[PDB]
Nucleic acid binder design. Sequence first.
RNA 1: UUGGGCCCGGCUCUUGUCUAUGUUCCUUGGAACAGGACGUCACAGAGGGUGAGAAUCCCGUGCGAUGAGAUGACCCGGGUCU
RNA 2: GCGAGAGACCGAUAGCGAACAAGUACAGUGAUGGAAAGAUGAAAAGAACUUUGAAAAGAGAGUGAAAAAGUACGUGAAAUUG
RNA 3: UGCUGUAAAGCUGGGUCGAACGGCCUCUAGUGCAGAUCUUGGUGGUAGUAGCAAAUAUUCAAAUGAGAACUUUGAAGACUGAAGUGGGGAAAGGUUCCAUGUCAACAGCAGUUGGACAUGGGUUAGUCGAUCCUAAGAGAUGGGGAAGCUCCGUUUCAACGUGC
RNA 4: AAACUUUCAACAACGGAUCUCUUGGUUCUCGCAUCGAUGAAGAACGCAGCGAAAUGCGAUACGUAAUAUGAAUUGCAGAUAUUCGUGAAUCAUCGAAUCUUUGAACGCACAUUGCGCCCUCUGGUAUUCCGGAGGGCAUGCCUGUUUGAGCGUCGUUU
Lengths: 119, 86, 71, 100, 52, 50
Amino acid sequence: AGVKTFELRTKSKEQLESQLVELKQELATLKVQKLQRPSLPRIHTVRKNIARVLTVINLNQRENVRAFYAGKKYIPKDLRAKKTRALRRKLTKFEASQETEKARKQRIAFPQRKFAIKA
Amino acid sequence: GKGTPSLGKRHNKSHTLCNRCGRRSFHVQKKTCSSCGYPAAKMRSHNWALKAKRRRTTGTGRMAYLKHVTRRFKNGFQTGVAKAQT
Amino acid sequence: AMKKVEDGNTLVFQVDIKSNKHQIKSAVKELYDVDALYVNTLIRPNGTKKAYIRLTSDYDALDIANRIGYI
Amino acid sequence: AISKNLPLLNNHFRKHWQERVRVHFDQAGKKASRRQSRLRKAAKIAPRPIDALRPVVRAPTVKYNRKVRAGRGFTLAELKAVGIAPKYARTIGISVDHRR
Amino acid sequence: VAENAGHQTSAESWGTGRAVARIPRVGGGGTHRSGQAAFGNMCRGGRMFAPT
Amino acid sequence: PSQKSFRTKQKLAKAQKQNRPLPQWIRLRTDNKIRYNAKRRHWRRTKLGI
RNA sequence: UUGGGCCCGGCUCUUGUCUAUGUUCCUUGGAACAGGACGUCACAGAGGGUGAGAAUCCCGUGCGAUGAGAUGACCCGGGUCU
RNA sequence: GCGAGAGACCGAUAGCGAACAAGUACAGUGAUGGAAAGAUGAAAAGAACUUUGAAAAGAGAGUGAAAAAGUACGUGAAAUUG
RNA sequence: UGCUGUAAAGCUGGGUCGAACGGCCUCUAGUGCAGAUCUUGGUGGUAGUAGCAAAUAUUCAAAUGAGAACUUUGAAGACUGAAGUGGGGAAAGGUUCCAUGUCAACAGCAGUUGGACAUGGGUUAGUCGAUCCUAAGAGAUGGGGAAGCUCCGUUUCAACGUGC
RNA sequence: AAACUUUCAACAACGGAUCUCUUGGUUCUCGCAUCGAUGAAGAACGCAGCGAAAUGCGAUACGUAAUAUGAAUUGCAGAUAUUCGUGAAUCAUCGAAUCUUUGAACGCACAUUGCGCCCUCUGGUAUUCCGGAGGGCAUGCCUGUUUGAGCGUCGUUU
Ligand SMILES: [Zn+2]
């Protein structure tokens, strides 16, 4: 099952880099042993361990960028919403709710009334 | 001598592999693919060739990104992460 | 491949298809701490890249191979 | 091609008509879904009625002078007589027709 | 039945003079389908008579 | 020929790797219908058309 | 005659979880899901599976109950502040 | 396209070309063309072992409800043949 | 195995087989085949027949092997006869290369042999090529046509240096 | 008289009809509105302990994270794998990522794995040469910023 993610996420950047290289040399050691076994299922465990560490390294590095760009007007396009191309071209709620002062006066002056019949 | 004797002189390919569709239909001298129309921006496709659309169209490949558009649409194109249940 | 370890002072490696002789020379310096006299590369009929890395007289290829542990 | 004492027919089927045949298999489904739309709309706005009040008008032409049917909207004069502004009238379920 | 069932072929009759019936046949070569009859209600793989 | 392009040689490498018989332990899997590799190719019989 | 924003509901959507009664007897059969006896449940006797035609063996079905997540200037029912 | 529910529809030469690793194998310089191919058994229990044979196989035996089910597998018609 | 019906057909005895199926009153249709140089599949007679006859030519022994006209080795006899049946390459092929094993299919006889089958191994460049140059030509750009797909033009009615 | 030929029956062949099935098709109905320069559809090449294809994925490669769930996977093997538990398996779910070479495909080019140039860091005694890592350099058009051109033209000073 390999290493466990929540331990990796409590580590710093420099610790993760040390464990990454420590796992990579161990994977290289196994591929040398594969020349003689040749069946060696532990290779599978190490390869997925390298994946987990690389994932934690990336996800930690990405949230540091998110904090750097919180509330800014312009942020990197990979940090923007990725809904669909058409939904990004669509008018925002503020833009779609924009209303001329003439139209605002009419809607306020004549709202849809509530009424009933036969009384 | 237009049969067997002439068939022995076939060693100069008219077509090579196309970069866009990988089909061996790229005309070397014309620099055009007779299959997909490369290097034109549009793909070559005709309404008089309906079986040819079947061979190369959406769904005949991986659909690696369109696979999940329905899944993302069904959840309203969420942002963020899932929460752990209390 | 193992005949080149003794007779040629050469280590034979499988290498990434995209790497050039400059990177392979640097790579063996980091991984096994050994200097390459030359790197001869080759792309195999099965599509992988093979490198022949001959070491300088400072290093013994047989000693290095036992360090790596494939002999 | 022309035989016996039969009526001469005008069957206009010399075009590719088989590509434009519309069979209304969905008549029952359309009826049911139309009722569902009507129910949803009624329930949204209750107790306010679903229909605006329509006037009564004379059908045009010499053939339909006798019949009287539902119009589109009360004229500005008719709303003037009962003292309802047309802008206001549209908000209380009374339909307005500036053209009549 | 499907509107094009039995009609997804480019078959042409070989005509006469080739010692085979004048039914349309599949062209090309290299598959066993080549030279086989097509489009007929009597043919394997053709379309039925008066499709529903 | 001897003088070939890298793109050509990359296609020939894949053509060989696909030209192997079926590994036998796959016949032993439950609900298995494959009896042999039906996409074998001989160099003299069918050309790659590359 | 009358503005706006937030907070909870409702309505719409998605989805999680939970539910009745024989595997009783005899014969045939490799196997009972078959025949016969006695039954039981039924807002469930649709369907599927299980070594042959299974409501009652299993999943479901029917009945609903209760969570969670959305979504809506352009739906309303309320608070609350302006 | 996405997701559902159905039928006096077809039932493997039918129904989509495709119930199968089907737009696959294969053909063509190319545009394009384009198949065939479902079913042991409930369960591989897929025949241990002996014998003849160089071997393939055979004869015994064995498993199985059935080998008049042996993967050249349900039934097994006709042409044709011993 | 018979019976019934003028018939279309129906029913039955025996054998085989293993999961559904019929009668009657109605409904409905992609509903009845001997033919279409019909379609697809299969199988015959012909028939153990035609044939397997170009390229001078093979023979003896040993080994291997269950088995040798055909494999290997030796001895011999031959031929290609340097514009070759020699030794290399370009195009094309794509692992056919080499070793080990092996003979179900293929090598129109055979097969212990093989370009077959199975498992592995194998292609090393500063100097050889590509890469660069321009040729016949192809073809962006600025522009000008064309509803448009695109067409012309190649420095062109251009403010043209990713200058040194 | 045998043989042979022909017919018939039994048995055995050849062959795959018939019969019964059926995770497929076909038609009708209902609901929905969601591809792409934030790089799509498609292609190529790769990736598993033992895989050719199909299916899945991209050098984090039959997958990583997260959420839910709650003991498997299975042809074989094997844990530096797990069981009253941050815990087996799971495209169950899925909101965070990875996403080779390409492709509208975008530095130029492309029958080449060809040729550049800029910035930062780095190795070789180096601002210039060679190598490495990372980040960049398409086109049309729009808004704006900056630097400009033109006796197009305005005011002043000769
Ligand atoms: Zn192409």
